[PDB]
Structures are given as structure tokens and as C-alpha cells.
């Protein structure tokens, strides 16, 4: 039927994690970029946005807004949300950690220059002492190739998306975490993700 | 019984109390009173990301509010009947979580920001959030947000209705279907009991 359509600015922001997820799952999708204040007004006036905000994803007859509502739908539909409620609970806990750390990095562009370098220090500290250790530990708990249930899930995709942003921020941060290093390699070589990393894909660049 | 590890306040764990109580589920609380109570949780390995809320439930130690709430809603059949209903539920409650996060962080706002933040909240309540939920109720005439049956969304929206009433009781006044939902849901036996003096429901912060 209808390809999904994704409505956002031509940038990573809040739609990037959905592009990764769809691309990871081998699903073809279309984008519709918001060029101006008037394009977003058009969306609002046409009643396309429940809460007057994008990201919005037109998919299977719905106009889903809220990143988490979109991700959750795509994850279940393409069997990347684990095989049962308990598995979904581990996935949720992992990905919400990832979302929290992600949020910090995503917002660092719009810090006050006053606060910026304590905020960066604070981030780097959480990564090294909080986040990378918890996942390294998960990976080391089972020695398996994926974070949950010994098969590809959304957790692996969101984690690896984040490991790319961490690299850009400071490529030394991951160096004392070998299992994370290996996870990043393995996931980046999966056909669909190798293609998404290749030039020409919907993958978006860092902002300028 | 599930066991909820938090401070003896609303914060990020009150939505879980509402949900469990709404689902007629008994739970325990183990309150964190000293910085050292929190140390022990950390050193014992109870917290994946070093933070509470944490719920010990069905033999897991779930942290993160969304993960805890996701598991409960499914387990007690308050997460609709299929993926498409779950996606509408998701959309609704994440909007509710966005408004709630703004109201939740208000006490800890730098004082010089407080006034503007409160006015931006009321403006968002009036023009963005309440109309959107009134719209949904109006479109189907049903007693429930989704599926014509009680769901987590109804529960989460009504909890937020109580917080908005605390902030300013005039804000709901031009939204009659929201007012009606608030009444209907507060009258469900489990919610009516939660709302009665003596339940694990927590007070606003000092």
C-alpha cells in the first residue's frame, strides 16, 4: 500500500532515529521537508498535527506524531520490539537510557555558551561512568551479538545510532569499551544498515 | 506484589501509582529517605542507569518511567487491542507526558524564569493540549479516549487534569468533554479509592 511519509525539517533532529529504524528494517519511505514557517503552518492548518508539532509520520492510514509513538509502531510492525512483554520491558529500559543520553547531546547546540563546557564535561562523564558501562555490561552478561533475545532489535539500532554521535563528539570515549566497539561494527555491516551509511541514503548530516 | 522504589513524593513515580491503582493492583513502596538509601540501591546493582524510579516487578528490576508504565499497561490490558490502537494510545500519552514534564519541572525552574514558564504552560494548555483531547472525544462521542474501553490514556489524561486543576481551575472550563471524562473516571471504584484520603497517592511538593 502506501509508503510511509515522514514530515520534518531536512535535518537530523527528532526524526533521525526513525530514519535509522525504517532503514534498518528494509522499509522504503518518502520524506517531505519543511522548508519554511509557512510549510509548518500549512501542516497545522490542514489538521495534520495533533499537537501542532512535527515529527509526523503518515503511515498505515494514521498521522502519528510524538517520536516515541512513531518508533514504537514501526518497531512492532517490523518485529524489532522483542518477542514478548518482558523482552519489550528490557528494550524499553535500554532505549529510554539511550534516549536520555541522546537528548543531552541533541540539545547541546542550544546551550548558553556560559554553560556549554560544564554541560559537555557533564555529558562525557555520564557516558564514561554511566551509559557505556551499563551497555558494555549487558553485552558482556550474555556474550551474544545483539542486546536482547539474541536477535536484532530496536535497541541495537538506537544504540549504534548513538555510538555514531558519540564518535563525532569525541572519538576516544568508546575506546575502553570493546564490546560496544564490536557491536557497532557488526550492526554497521548488516546489509540494510551498510546501505544506510553509504552516500545517497536518507541519512542526514550533523548541523552547521 | 510489585515494589516501587522512589522518594516519598510524586515526581516521576506518581504516574505508575495511578496506573497500578487504576488497574486494581496492590503494590508496595520502599521509600528512599537518605542519600545513603540511594547508595545502597546503586551498589547492590538494582539500578541500570544509577537512577530511580525502579520497580521490582515480575522478577525484573525495571528503571525508566516509560518502561515501567509500558510493561504495566500491557500486562493489565490497558494498552488497547492491537498495534494501531497502541499507536493512538502512544500519541496521546506522549503529548500528555510533554505537558506533564513542563508542569513537573516548574518547582525547580530558575525564579527569574518562573513567570514566563507558567504563562507558556497555560497558553499551551488552552491552545494546544486541551483542544486536541476535546477534539478526540468529540469525534467519537465515546466515554473512553481509545477503543470504547478504559485504557492507560484515560488514566494518564485524568491524572494530568488534577495537576492542571491545582495550577488553575479555570483552565478546563471551556472543555466540557474533558470535564466529563474527569468525572467519569474519578468515579471508577479503583480510581475513586486511590483519590480517597489514605491511599498511596502523593501530595504536591511543599
UniProtKB/Swiss-Prot annotation, chain A:
pH-linked activity: Optimum pH is 8.0 for the isomerization of androst-5-ene-3,17-dione.
GO BP terms in the entry: epithelial cell differentiation; glutathione derivative biosynthetic process; glutathione metabolic process; linoleic acid metabolic process; prostaglandin metabolic process; xenobiotic metabolic process
Membrane recorded as keyword: no
Modified residues (N6-succinyllysine): 3
Activity regulation (UniProt): The isomerase activity is inhibited by S-methylglutathione (GSMe).
Domain called GST N-terminal: residue spans: 2-82
Sites of N-acetylalanine modification: 1
Enzyme Commission no: 2.5.1.18, 1.11.1.-, 5.3.3.-
Reactions it catalyzes: RX + glutathione = an S-substituted glutathione + a halide anion + H(+); prostaglandin A2 + glutathione = prostaglandin A2-S-(R)-glutathione; prostaglandin J2 + glutathione = prostaglandin J2-S-(R)-glutathione; (13S)-hydroperoxy-(9Z,11E)-octadecadienoate + 2 glutathione = (13S)-hydroxy-(9Z,11E)-octadecadienoate + glutathione disulfide + H2O
PANTHER family in UniProt: GLUTATHIONE S-TRANSFERASE, GLUTATHIONE S-TRANSFERASE A1
UniProt family annotation: Belongs to the GST superfamily. Alpha family.
Domain notes: The C-terminal domain may form a component of the hydrophobic substrate-binding site, but in contrast appears not to be directly involved in GSH binding and is not absolutely essential for catalytic activity.
Function as written in the Swiss-Prot or TrEMBL entry: Glutathione S-transferase that catalyzes the nucleophilic attack of the sulfur atom of glutathione on the electrophilic groups of a wide range of exogenous and endogenous compounds. Involved in the formation of glutathione conjugates of both prostaglandin A2 (PGA2) and prostaglandin J2 (PGJ2). It also catalyzes the isomerization of D5-androstene-3,17-dione (AD) into D4-androstene-3,17-dione and may therefore play an important role in hormone biosynthesis.
Record protein name field: Glutathione S-transferase A1
Higher taxonomy: Eukaryota, Metazoa, Chordata, Craniata, Vertebrata
From Swiss-Prot, chain B:
An example Gene Ontology molecular-function term: glutathione peroxidase activity
Keywords, sorted A to Z: Acetylation, Cytoplasm, Isomerase, Lipid metabolism, Oxidoreductase, Peroxidase, Transferase
One BP term from GO: linoleic acid metabolic process
This protein's GO CC annotations: cytosol; extracellular exosome
Outcome of substituting residue 6 to F: Decreased isomerase activity
Keyword NAD assigned: no
Acetylation is among the record's keywords: yes
UniProt tissue specificity: Liver.
PROSITE patterns on file: GST_CTER, GST_NTER
GST C-terminal domain ranges (all copies): 82-204
Alphabetical list of Pfam families matching this protein: GST_C, GST_N
pH dependence: Optimum pH is 8.0 for the isomerization of androst-5-ene-3,17-dione.
EC number: 2.5.1.18, 1.11.1.-, 5.3.3.-
Annotated ranges, domain GST N-terminal: 1-80
Chemical reaction(s) catalysed: RX + glutathione = an S-substituted glutathione + a halide anion + H(+); prostaglandin A2 + glutathione = prostaglandin A2-S-(R)-glutathione; prostaglandin J2 + glutathione = prostaglandin J2-S-(R)-glutathione; (13S)-hydroperoxy-(9Z,11E)-octadecadienoate + 2 glutathione = (13S)-hydroxy-(9Z,11E)-octadecadienoate + glutathione disulfide + H2O
CDD domains: GST_C_Alpha, GST_N_Alpha
Known regulation of activity: The isomerase activity is inhibited by S-methylglutathione (GSMe).
Main localization (coarse): cytoplasm
Domain description: The C-terminal domain may form a component of the hydrophobic substrate-binding site, but in contrast appears not to be directly involved in GSH binding and is not absolutely essential for catalytic activity.
Binding partners and assembly: Homodimer or heterodimer of GSTA1 and GSTA2.
PANTHER family in the record: GLUTATHIONE S-TRANSFERASE (PTHR11571), GLUTATHIONE S-TRANSFERASE A1 (PTHR11571:SF107)
Family (UniProt): Belongs to the GST superfamily. Alpha family.
Name of the molecule in the record: Glutathione S-transferase A1
